[PDB]
Amino acid sequence: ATFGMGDRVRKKSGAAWQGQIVGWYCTNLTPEGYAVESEAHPGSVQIYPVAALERIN
Amino acid sequence: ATFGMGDRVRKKSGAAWQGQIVGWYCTNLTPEGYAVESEAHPGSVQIYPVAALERIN
Amino acid sequence: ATFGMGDRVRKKSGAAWQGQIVGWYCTNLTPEGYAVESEAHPGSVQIYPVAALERIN
Amino acid sequence: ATFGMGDRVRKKSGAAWQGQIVGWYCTNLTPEGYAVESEAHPGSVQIYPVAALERIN
Known about the structure:
Four copies of one chain form a homotetramer. The first copy, chain A, is mainly beta and 57 residues long. Chain A has strands at residues 8-11, 18-25, 33-38, 45-49, 53-55.
């Protein structure tokens, strides 16, 4: 896995999103995906493919 | 309609979300729903029933 | 507008989705977007840019 | 965990959703959540709290 639980990540491009890794998913379309809880909006989680995300400090 | 385009709203409870009304939807489950663009995460939009949202200054 | 309320649409590519137009949204990232209620999963709605969708019979 | 990868589940109420468990997430709001890939709409995944889902054959 590219990321681990608790890593701070953001969307690289397009629609913005930033916060902590809180889970994972795997489909044929998205064989490595992550759930990210917004640091701005507690409790709201969105899922993205790994290629859409980057780790930040 | 309870809200109009550009109103600043937030989720009342549970998962947080805050930003501008940017659209509308209507289903039998949700006969009055709104699309809200996050003010923290430009470009990210989430849809909610009217009962889940409140207008703020 | 490309689509109207009640049009049957689908995602063109990638993640699948199919059902009726039930609303609209507009942001700078997505100046023409639509809400689509799944015909398979009543009550579940997802929003997409117009370029991601096609009308079907 | 209540569910495992590959279990067939559905939403119990409200907005419908049905398909296979494809991942997991954990937040304070949702300490046990699951990602479910629709069986009707390949590639589309939605996340829900465990209490919202039930396993089916």
